[PDB]
Ligand binder design. Sequence first.
Ligand SMILES: Cc1cc2nc3c(=O)[nH]c(=O)nc-3n(C[C@H](O)[C@H](O)[C@H](O)COP(=O)(O)OP(=O)(O)OC[C@H]3O[C@@H](n4cnc5c(N)ncnc54)[C@H](O)[C@@H]3O)c2cc1C
Ligand SMILES: Cc1cc2nc3c(=O)[nH]c(=O)nc-3n(C[C@H](O)[C@H](O)[C@H](O)COP(=O)(O)OP(=O)(O)OC[C@H]3O[C@@H](n4cnc5c(N)ncnc54)[C@H](O)[C@@H]3O)c2cc1C
Ligand code: SF4
Ligand code: SF4
Ligand code: SF4
Ligand code: SF4
Ligand code: SF4
Ligand code: SF4
Ligand code: SF4
Ligand code: SF4
Ligand code: SF4
Ligand code: SF4
Ligand code: SF4
Ligand code: SF4
Ligand code: SF4
Ligand code: FES
Lengths: 183, 92, 129, 284, 643, 460
Amino acid sequence: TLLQREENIIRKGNIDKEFSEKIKAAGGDSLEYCFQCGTCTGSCPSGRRTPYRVRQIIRKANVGLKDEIISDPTLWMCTTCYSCQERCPRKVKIVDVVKLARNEAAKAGFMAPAHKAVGSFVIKTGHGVPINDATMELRKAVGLGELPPTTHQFPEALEEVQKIIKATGFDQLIGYNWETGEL
Amino acid sequence: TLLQREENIIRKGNIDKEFSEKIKAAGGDSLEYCFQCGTCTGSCPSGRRTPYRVRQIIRKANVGLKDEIISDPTLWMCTTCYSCQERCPRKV
Amino acid sequence: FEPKIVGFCCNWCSYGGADTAGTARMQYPPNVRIIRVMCSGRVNASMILKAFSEGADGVFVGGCHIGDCHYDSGNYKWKRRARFIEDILPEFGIDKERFRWEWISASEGEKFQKTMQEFYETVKYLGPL
Amino acid sequence: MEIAYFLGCIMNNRYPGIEKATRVLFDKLGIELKDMEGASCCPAPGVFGSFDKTTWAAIAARNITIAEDMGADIMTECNGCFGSLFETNHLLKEDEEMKAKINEILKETGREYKGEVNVRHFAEVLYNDVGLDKLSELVEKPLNLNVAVHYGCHFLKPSDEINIDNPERPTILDEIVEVTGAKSVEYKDKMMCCGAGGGVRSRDLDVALDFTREKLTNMKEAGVDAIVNVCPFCHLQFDVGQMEIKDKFGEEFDIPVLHLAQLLGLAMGLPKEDLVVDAHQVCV
Amino acid sequence: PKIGVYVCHCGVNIGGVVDVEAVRDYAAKLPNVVIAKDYKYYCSDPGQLEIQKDIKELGINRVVVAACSPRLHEPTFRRCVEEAGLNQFLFEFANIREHDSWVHMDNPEGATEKAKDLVRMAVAKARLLEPLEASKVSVDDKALVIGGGVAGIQAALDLADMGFKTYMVEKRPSISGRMGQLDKTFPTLDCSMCILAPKMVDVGKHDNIELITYAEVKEVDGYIGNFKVKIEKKPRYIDEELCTGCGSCVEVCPIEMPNYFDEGIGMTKAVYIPFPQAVPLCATIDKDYCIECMLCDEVCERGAVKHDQEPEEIEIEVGTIIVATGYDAYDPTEKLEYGYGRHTNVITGLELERMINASGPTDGKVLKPSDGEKPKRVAFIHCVGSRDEQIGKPYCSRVCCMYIMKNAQLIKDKMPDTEVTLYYMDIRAFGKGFEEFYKRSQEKYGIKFIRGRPAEVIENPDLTLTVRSEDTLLGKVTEYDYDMVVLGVGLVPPEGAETLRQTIGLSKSADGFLMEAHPKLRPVDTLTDGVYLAGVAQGPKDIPDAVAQASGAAARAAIPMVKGEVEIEPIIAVTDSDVCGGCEVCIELCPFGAISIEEGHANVNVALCKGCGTCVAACPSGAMDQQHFKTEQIMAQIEAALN
Amino acid sequence: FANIREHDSWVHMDNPEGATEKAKDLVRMAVAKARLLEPLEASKVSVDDKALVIGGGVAGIQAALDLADMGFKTYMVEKRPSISGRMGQLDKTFPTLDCSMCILAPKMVDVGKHDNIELITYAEVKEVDGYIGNFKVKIEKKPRYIDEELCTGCGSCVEVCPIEMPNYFDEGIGMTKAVYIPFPQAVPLCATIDKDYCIECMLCDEVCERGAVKHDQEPEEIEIEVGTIIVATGYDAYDPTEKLEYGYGRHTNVITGLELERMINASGPTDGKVLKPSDGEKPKRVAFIHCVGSRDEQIGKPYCSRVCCMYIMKNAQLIKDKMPDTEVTLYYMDIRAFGKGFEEFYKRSQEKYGIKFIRGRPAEVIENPDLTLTVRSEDTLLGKVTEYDYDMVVLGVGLVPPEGAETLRQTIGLSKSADGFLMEAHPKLRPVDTLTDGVYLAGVAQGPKDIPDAVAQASG
Ligand SMILES: Cc1cc2nc3c(=O)[nH]c(=O)nc-3n(C[C@H](O)[C@H](O)[C@H](O)COP(=O)(O)OP(=O)(O)OC[C@H]3O[C@@H](n4cnc5c(N)ncnc54)[C@H](O)[C@@H]3O)c2cc1C
Ligand SMILES: Cc1cc2nc3c(=O)[nH]c(=O)nc-3n(C[C@H](O)[C@H](O)[C@H](O)COP(=O)(O)OP(=O)(O)OC[C@H]3O[C@@H](n4cnc5c(N)ncnc54)[C@H](O)[C@@H]3O)c2cc1C
Ligand code: SF4
Ligand code: SF4
Ligand code: SF4
Ligand code: SF4
Ligand code: SF4
Ligand code: SF4
Ligand code: SF4
Ligand code: SF4
Ligand code: SF4
Ligand code: SF4
Ligand code: SF4
Ligand code: SF4
Ligand code: SF4
Ligand code: FES
């Protein structure tokens, strides 16, 4: 059956004005004066190959459809290429709104495992892409040091990075467990 | 994956102008001068409980998206209640 | 303590700016008293000194933006006079923060309101002269 | 001239040839590259900026303080790292409350953000501080190459803040590339994203690979011999994604991927082993 | 001094905040005050009658009104006191509404105290006022009209039919403006030239109109009724009195140059006539392209070719000025994503107007620039150069929607098989018959409307153009191919607008067009007396709105010229010869040079003085004093403000 | 004159030979007629240097003042007891949000004091005869039952009157007495008795000190001779009662834009407070609906009313300034912000005041048991039906020709356009002339438009 009494109508029960106020207060206030020309969607390269529609994201953020935004997989199709923002005739900070919505979605548990894995790599070694043995050999062969002068080479720097992550609560966000060093 | 390279863009390969000409010649010529106010969808009782959107059907008929219309299940959600037609400001 | 403030505003822009603030109903403290002149070029140091000698705790002067004077050069002469007055006032125990002069355009009601509020706060903090 | 040298992750951990070529090129230009001891992920904006702004800003601010300690501007040759560091720098400089919050977080690490240095891009430093004439003088092996220039999204955008070149039709990278004797070839959708940004590569590999496949189809139709980039993130996308596209759809492009520093090293007669071509998955 | 004080309630605008009962009693108790009254609306007729009756009965010789700002109603009360026999300048205004009541709503007690202090200051000033007779100056019954478009033509014809001798200065060799370049007009699709050409001929034949084309206004000096204008007539190198416009010189000329009339898509010769209906029908030589071959000299039978012509200087004296300088079309080259100037088959709306014109460069055929063949698919893009903060153009151009729809309809009628699509954000069909025209574009001609602002225009190898744009009503990205793309460019102020604005001394609005005196009730007046606006000079609009504005400007400029006199305010510097030492530190401070030295004493010229008071403030000894702003008056006001 | 272009060349393009033969025949006919023509001297007739202006709104006031300042003696006939038109009823004006009365009242006083203007209010033009320069006009002055020469507009009669009747100025939401002054700034400031409500209690007679009350007054007949006529009769607001799906006149908390203008006016019936008609409390949620009575073939109104977009946005901005906590939503098809500063005003409605715009023409307005209103409408940019609740709904009614427009049009002998407004001589180049010589149009009489356009037309 095509019947579904909740998905095909918008009432006040679908609206969270606090979400819109939070987004605007956090640096996405420009979304208030989008007039829905659709230039952003036309400029969007991910909108051409996925169901992602940035204009509708901006509209939902203005209306206050939190649950519809944060739980939406297409919210993660934006590459932050800024093509939309360069062309918006109303000078809306589209990428800022997208990132704020992604922050809210992450707070609600809509984080992909691969992104959490990147976060765990940063926690463990300080590098989103840590070095592997083959690259160490390549570095040695070409006159560079076996390890780059980074958190790879300085444990105290890694400790500082871990202190920052603990202070910001990022480890709790991705569910990193220090005791076992797993997610 | 959310990737699908055909469903998220409209090109001339999705358009059949003969379909639009046939519809207009068969008694649906008024669809030419719909200005997409959305009164019909707001008046539609089936649009409130199904994915059926009559305004988008009219738009697709004008554009010529035959395959998108005829294969659409929601096309069969209309009860022919005439609520939309009584209120259309363009008398479509 | 409620400071006594005297204001001089040119007819064409600064007085227009105060009128704009009024029409928009931009609230500000009631201590200031505006006196109208045709041009800020009409203001000289004798008026400022007379105001301070008569009991004023602050003196404000408003003019057209440089290049916008109705009489086309008056605010330049006022600006020179105002710099000299700022030189003279501290020699008699009057802080130069009690003498403020600003360029206010006829449409700048909000700037006029903010100037009035801030000048009142400054003069009140300084205390009685 | 002295400048702090930020490395990032992908360059130093997957493609050291870019780093070696850059070090050699800057030594030939009389610019002292100072290592930023203890630097970490910038962090990659796609994931960290998407997850928590505060953590991203704090890590970037610590990286910036590493360079502030040496009293030197930061130089990056990754568009992703440049974007992250530059955005954090101009956010903390122009926002006192956010600066206070980030400094409160940084306190326990024994660091404080002062907002005393500038974040600069590798290509921008080459164009402004060195100039096209000095770069031309150092060319000893004028190249005969048709190259597709991939600007990457975060080199020039958001242009309201970066103000380096016009994002729609820039020419800075084309001029730098042509100083080497190679020819920058126009192709369809040249300013298109590679698909790796915003964390998309790790979230939906198929979407990012279609970005790359579209770009590669457009480049191939133009007949280019190589791809030139100023972003190790884009570099990795093109290099590894060509292999991934071959395995998934059996489509062969065989378009070598070079960093601008590597192209400059090739035109300057650097040793072949210094370019570390063995790091690349696509044979050059 | 018998001061009568009148405190206005203004309904509740003052009374609501300020106690008009306490203030009235305070005024009644002040020295020299013989009466204090309050009325609900003093500016109204009953209030003025009350003031006049009080003056007649109690013999008041000073009138003080505690009411709104003087900039609003000072002339009203000045005339009110005049009609009762009192002198104009024995009158004083206290500002207790904009300066007190509307800005201290939360402090009613402080508001009332401030009102008391302000009325005290006003009475202190009014005590020392004295009568001043205002001098009348004659108003010249002549008008200048700058710009020879439809608005300027209408204004000139209306002024000339009302009997006033009018000058019409036009920078192009011929009059017509942009209306002469149009093929048809919306919403009727009537020929624009067929209805404009008779008016152009009328302007050319009127006994009361002096038409000076190919000329610019270089200098403007003076004031209302008394404008001195220096005009520079550029050399045509053709004798206007002799040339008949036959066109043989054009036939023989070997050099080819762009025709300005054709907007960059039409060619003419170095000697050219802009269009067949030109007024004056005269030839013009552009020396940037002339090689001085003398072929035109030899072929001309009237002897009208003058290669040694020089620019001419004309000086006129007028009483009123009407600026009707129109607009330029926006240049979309800076919109790089749309590729104007880069893609071959991308054109603008005005270029399309020239192309669809039967008298245009292509003989009325819409042909692709790339190959000279008719396009089968045409896209129109709305709001190019308008409603866009990325280029600092946040306004609507107000006519592009309609002329886009009109040109789509014209392309359909000429080539019925053509497909036409419009990319719009809003369809602004607001005028009379405009909504019906909009519906007819769909019902009759089958034009397709896509609600979406295009993201990009991509030129394909075969030179066709892909418009990449979201269909926001389908909610999906589309990439559609077209043989031609027409940019709906907006309207911008004409080239050299700032020079003329500075020459006259006018202000401009946020959009860059000239600013009217009042947005609602004085749309054609400016704040400079004797200068008026007509047509797109005041902002984008269509032909009937411009014509209505031109007629209104003619009426407004005629009023003072019919009156024949204006009053000069006597607020001027006066020198006390017995006190003046001839130091002369005052002369250079007058920007108008009103002060000279006679018999070792400073002497002010009333005609030159404007009443700024700068010289008076500069005079140490006080020999110089401004009327109505004397030093004693301001000193009394300062004293009363604090005591 | 031989007509060989409209009658021959443009209608026989496919038959050039037949076209040339027809041209030859037509020129032969023209010469045959011209052979027998003879001279005729045309007679000149004097043009009276007097003007009549019908309608005392902003356009009519402007036209009368311009004619009188040019030296011509002008008559101004106004059917209401006072001049001002619809501009006097507005609180503020777009796009500046300036007070309309503060700028209109001086012009009204000027009209009332001008030596060259004869103001005849509470009067109608009954007959027009003659031609340009030679118009004979019969005007009927209705009985005020108050002596205009004696009444001072003090208002004591109003204070003592026991009967209450609707005030026409307040557009059906304000009350006054059987003897009333339409508003404090009325010109002439004079009282008027409506005998449909007067009970003849003579309390006003007893309280009046000027002896201005005249219960035995009769209608007066005035005959004037003028040279020109300017029709400036304005418009009426559309009555949305026939739009049954929106429930105007049935739902308590549904109002029109003009009623809202009266309600937001500080001098209006509610002292400038926007209050629900149902309970007299401020609404927390307000919806505006665009294009009510316009752009609608279901009611035979296919034109745009041209001002409803802007005054809708203006009144939304005013509601926000007065009650910042109020939520305001506008339901629109197109936003027609075409005028000078209009697009900036439109952007300011969003950026500064936080007004919400929904692109969708509402399907229905449903009154809930608690008297709140559900607007059922598609959000076409979300592509989904919405049912949103509001405490107040304001219909953006369009402009229609005024009551009695056809009578005056027939009296003068003018034609009308497809929209029902008076027709100008030429759409492009003669916007204020008619095809009747000596008769001119100004303001909304010629079609909907805003105040500056009407003022420009009046001057023209
Ligand atoms: C493509 C297009 C199509 C249009 N179609 C229509 C339509 O169908 N119907 C319609 O009603 N309107 C239409 N318009 C709008 C219409 O053209 C304007 O309303 C009208 O041209 C304005 O007339 P104007 O006299 O104010 O200005 P213009 O027509 O621009 O005339 C101004 C004149 O002033 C002269 N001038 C400029 N500067 C100076 C100077 N310093 N000294 C002396 N002279 C000077 C110019 O050379 C010009 O002759 C269209 C506009 C465009 C761009
Ligand atoms: C709710 C609303 C808000 C608006 N807000 C604005 C705004 O903010 N800014 C703006 O610029 N415009 C606004 N407008 C439009 C503006 O009101 C009109 O442009 C203007 O009123 C037109 O003036 P007018 O003189 O042509 O007509 P009117 O104002 O209607 O005046 C016509 C006069 O003619 C009289 N009359 C009618 N028939 C006869 C007759 N037979 N004999 C004698 N007299 C007769 C009438 O009684 C009236 O006094 C608004 C309109 C509405 C409905
Ligand atoms: S481009 Fe800007 S104004 Fe247009 S829909 Fe996107 S965010 Fe809104
Ligand atoms: S930044 Fe995101 S939303 Fe904007 S164009 Fe790029 S992918 Fe699309
Ligand atoms: S109601 Fe009529 S005009 Fe509106 S969208 Fe439906 S069919 Fe089109
Ligand atoms: S007839 Fe009824 S069910 Fe069918 S589209 Fe119209 S309103 Fe919907
Ligand atoms: S005089 Fe001024 S304050 Fe008094 S009623 Fe008139 S406008 Fe209002
Ligand atoms: S210059 Fe001589 S030849 Fe040329 S158009 Fe004039 S009259 Fe004819
Ligand atoms: S002299 Fe000049 S204008 Fe005349 S024919 Fe020669 S090139 Fe042409
Ligand atoms: S009139 Fe239409 S096309 Fe022109 S700027 Fe306004 S909305 Fe855009
Ligand atoms: S400054 Fe005074 S004293 Fe000197 S010349 Fe002028 S008026 Fe005379
Ligand atoms: S008052 Fe001003 S304009 Fe007059 S003489 Fe003095 S300086 Fe010159
Ligand atoms: S009729 Fe008499 S009491 Fe009534 S308002 Fe007129 S003068 Fe006053
Ligand atoms: S006589 Fe009529 S108008 Fe007068 S008070 Fe009685 S009811 Fe009212
Ligand atoms: S102006 Fe706006 S609200 Fe009024 S009819 Fe036109 S589109 Fe509808
Ligand atoms: S007029 Fe204001 S400063 Fe000269």
